[PDB]
Amino acid sequence: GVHTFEEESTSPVPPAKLFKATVVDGDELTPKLIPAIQSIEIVEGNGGPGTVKKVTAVEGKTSYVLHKIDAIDEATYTYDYTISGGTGFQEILEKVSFKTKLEAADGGSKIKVSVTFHTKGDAPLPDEVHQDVKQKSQGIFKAIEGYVLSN
Ligand SMILES: O=S(=O)(O)c1cccc2cccc(Nc3ccccc3)c12
Ligand SMILES: O=S(=O)(O)c1cccc2cccc(Nc3ccccc3)c12
Ligand SMILES: O=S(=O)(O)c1cccc2cccc(Nc3ccccc3)c12
Ligand SMILES: O=S(=O)(O)c1cccc2cccc(Nc3ccccc3)c12
Ligand SMILES: O=S(=O)(O)c1cccc2cccc(Nc3ccccc3)c12
Ligand SMILES: O=S(=O)(O)c1cccc2cccc(Nc3ccccc3)c12
């Protein structure tokens, strides 16, 4: 099954600053801010498209998922990535593809996302899986946003 969700939100942080923290410095900041995330390790690449990362978390059980950069562009505040594989990843998911873009709005940012869940089999995406992936996505982003506001 393919399950696509599009949403907009806002931040009081302007986009160059918010993009730098969430995307350019996201690999170093995320484990500093989210206690459960132990490490973000680059498996392949340079931080450009095609870069593969291993994200390790404690959910006392340690597990991991893999991220791939699909697109990244500082001038357009664009970051598209796919989460797939690993011991930490929901059994029912093949992958989740994220497309994220910021734009300047009202001294802060507008945030535009598209999230595509790919499930095994032909059943609806379970509400619990949608809720869990949205809560993790929001939690990381909002923890980084709070850190920027506190600096
Ligand atoms: O971490 S390891 O235990 O080898 C490992 C264990 C299990 C699955 C892995 C998948 C991709 C990369 C790894 N290692 C990796 C390679 C380069 C940098 C960081 C991690 C994986
Ligand atoms: O070999 S590694 O260098 O970690 C490695 C390097 C690059 C990519 C990898 C992907 C999956 C597993 C690995 N390692 C692995 C870990 C434990 C058992 C078997 C393989 C990967
Ligand atoms: O990769 S993260 O950026 O943390 C992440 C970000 C956004 C959504 C995620 C959904 C499932 C698992 C993740 N990580 C995870 C990693 C290791 C173990 C268990 C879950 C998600
Ligand atoms: O088969 S999965 O269940 O995803 C899986 C489960 C557990 C550990 C995995 C480690 C590396 C790649 C996988 N799959 C993969 C292969 C290519 C791209 C992305 C992920 C792993
Ligand atoms: O939740 S939102 O406010 O759109 C959101 C806010 C801020 C950052 C986000 C990053 C990735 C995905 C989101 N949304 C999303 C939508 C559906 C499923 C999973 C994540 C993000
Ligand atoms: O700390 S846990 O939730 O265990 C966690 C476990 C594994 C992976 C996680 C990835 C992102 C955010 C988390 N925490 C989080 C914190 C507050 C709100 C939303 C998500 C992750």
UniProtKB/TrEMBL annotation:
The keyword rRNA-binding does not apply. Keywords: Pathogenesis-related protein, Plant defense. It holds the Pfam family Bet_v_1. Belongs to the BetVI family. This is Ara h 8 allergen isoform. InterPro entries: Bet_v_I/MLP, Bet_v_I_allergen, Plant_def-hormone_signal, START-like_dom_sf. The keyword Transmembrane helix does not apply. GO terms for molecular function: abscisic acid binding; protein phosphatase inhibitor activity; signaling receptor activity. It comes from Arachis hypogaea (Peanut). Residues 1-151 form the Bet v I/Major latex protein domain. GO terms for cellular component: cytoplasm; nucleus. One of its GO terms (biological process) is defense response.
